[PDB]
């Protein structure tokens, strides 16, 4: 049983329908570069939509983002024992939780489904249901790559750990010109090609 | 290259809290407030990992206390009702009688309270409807996903009705089988 560990939220420093609303958010962010090689821990605290205090492992101390976090940071940097856990979180929290989950998150591959249909001239290459989001779509008009007339909807998150995108081609098909759409994805061992067959 | 966030929030006076995990924009798991247990976004994830929810609920209690201190230190300054962006999508390209999913995507909003209702021909659909939790953004607003599995029809029209305090009326985004492309 692989186990996820938590980063403990720190206690702060003491100074129905049409009612005021008050929100406090805490985000413990782990940023990864080159796999588990370069790891940056980032303990960030928010009131409403605004950051007030933040721990950066590249800085090594709690610093105030606005004036409201100034009592907290001085309090939190007055306890060196707390700061040692916050600095060691890069190895004990970020890299651990990267480890328990690398199989089904980092190395997750889902096959894209590719469809070519004409719309309201205009051709659409709809690529749906893939993971990760690193996708590359090219339009080959008569065996020639079109760089003039390609508009993409961009990466669209579905929330099912699946992405989708609709790359469009604005051209003028007249008599039996063959059009080809190609998809490059890490879940594919070879590039995927679909022809419109005019 | 990769980003994993432990996302926590608490909202007063609704007294609503949330603890969840995020990998590169997608939810890994969400600790359910009631029933005191983890809910993996994909069921396979629970057969590959595990997490104790009770310490997460302790962190939510710490978030409640920190919200008390921040509310006193802000002279009771309220949150801004940032209105939401609603787009109705389809999981696959629609063909008639070929099963698909209608996705109501809600984006760029705070506070994280929204009333979402699916309407089939103007009638609410309260059963067989899925949803995600309030997923956090990097501008520290919120996004949410709602799913209605359906079977496309020539005559049926659907509506996503999203209610937020940043709006003066409920927002109604329309979808029919014809004119399914509004994405420029």
């Amino acid at each position, epitope marked *: 049983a692989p186990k996820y560990v938590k980063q403990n939220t720190l206690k702060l420093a003491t100074s129905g329908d049409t009612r005021p609303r008050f929100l406090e958010q805490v985000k413990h962010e782990c940023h990864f570069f080159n796999g588990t090689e370069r790891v940056r821990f980032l303990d960030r605290y928010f009131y409403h939509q*605004e*950051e007030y205090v933040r721990f950066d492992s590249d800085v090594g101390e709690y610093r105030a983002v606005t*004036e409201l976090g100034r009592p907290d940071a001085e309090y939190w940097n007055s306890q060196k024992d707390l700061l040692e856990q916050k600095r060691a979180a890069v190895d004990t929290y970020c890299r651990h939780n990267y480890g328990v989950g690398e199989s089904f998150t980092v190395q997750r591959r889902v096959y894209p489904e590719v469809t070519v249909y004409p719309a309201k001239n205009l051709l659409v290459c709809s690529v749906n249901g893939f993971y990760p989001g690193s996708i590359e779509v090219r339009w080959f008009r008569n065996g020639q790559e079109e760089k003039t007339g390609v508009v993409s909807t961009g990466l669209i998150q579905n929330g099912d750990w699946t992405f989708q995108t609709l790359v469009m081609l604005e051209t003028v098909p007249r008599s039996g010109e063959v059009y080809t759409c190609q998809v490059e994805h890490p879940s594919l061992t070879s590039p995927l090609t679909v022809e419109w067959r005019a | 290259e990769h980003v994993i966030i432990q996302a926590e929030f608490y909202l007063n006076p609704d007294q609503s809290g949330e603890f969840m995990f995020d990998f590169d924009g997608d939810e890994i798991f969400h600790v359910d407030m009631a029933k005191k247990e983890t809910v993996w976004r994909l069921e396979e994830f629970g057969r590959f990992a595990s997490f104790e929810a009770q310490g997460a609920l302790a962190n939510i209690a710490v978030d409640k206390a920190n919200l008390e201190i921040m509310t006193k230190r802000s002279n009771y300054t309220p949150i801004t009702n*940032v*209105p939401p962006e609603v787009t109705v999508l389809t999981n696959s390209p629609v063909e008639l009688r070929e099963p698909n999913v209608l996705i109501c995507f809600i984006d760029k909003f705070t506070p994280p309270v929204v009333n979402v209702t699916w309407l089939r021909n103007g009638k609410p659909v309260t059963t067989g409807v899925s949803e995600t939790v309030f997923l956090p953004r990097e*501008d520290h607003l919120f996004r949410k996903f709602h799913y209605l599995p359906f079977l496309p029809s020539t005559e049926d029209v659907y509506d996503c009705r999203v209610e937020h305090w940043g709006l003066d009326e409920p*927002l109604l985004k329309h979808w029919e089988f014809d004119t399914s492309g509004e994405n420029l």
Partner: antibody
Amino acid sequence: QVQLQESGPGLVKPSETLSLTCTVSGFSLTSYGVHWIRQPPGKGLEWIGVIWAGGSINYNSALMSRVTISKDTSKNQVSLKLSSVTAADTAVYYCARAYGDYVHYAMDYWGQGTLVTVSS
Amino acid sequence: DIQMTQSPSSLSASVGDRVTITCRASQEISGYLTWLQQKPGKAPKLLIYAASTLDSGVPKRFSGSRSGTDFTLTISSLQPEDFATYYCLQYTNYPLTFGQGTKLEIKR
């Protein structure tokens, strides 16, 4: 490439009608509304009006009788007309973008602006 | 119809300084304030919306908050390219009204 680009005459005689067009790209005029804001040189900014994605049009009370804002979604353009222009209407005119059909949606991505000089 | 009072009218500060522009509202704007930056010969660029939400493409050194009933744009470490005119804008009710503007200049 989200772009908004103003276009128009530049020089209008007094008491005539100024006619400007904002041509947009990168987004849809059926999903986005656009604001018209004018800035006299040296002075501040002044909101002229909005045309939302649903076709709702809102003008300012000071220029209510003189401002007409319309929309051609097919050509991705929005037109602003000022009737009976005076020398106070000489300004740099801007079209900006907002989401949806409500005022509480923030104004994103302004355009570069065109200069209109009212002189005979 | 809603009044936005911007202060100070002009400002000069050194590189690396922390500057603070304040904007008073006559009524309550319910958090719907936008901070805009206009470099000369250019359009206003969206810096902050909803009084503290940072637009994508704005650097981290800009921050928005509320000092009591007044609103606050804060540049943490001032840079030479931040010479501009800054405007506050309410978007809670028609008509949308801007401030007079603050001309931020660089000392050297």
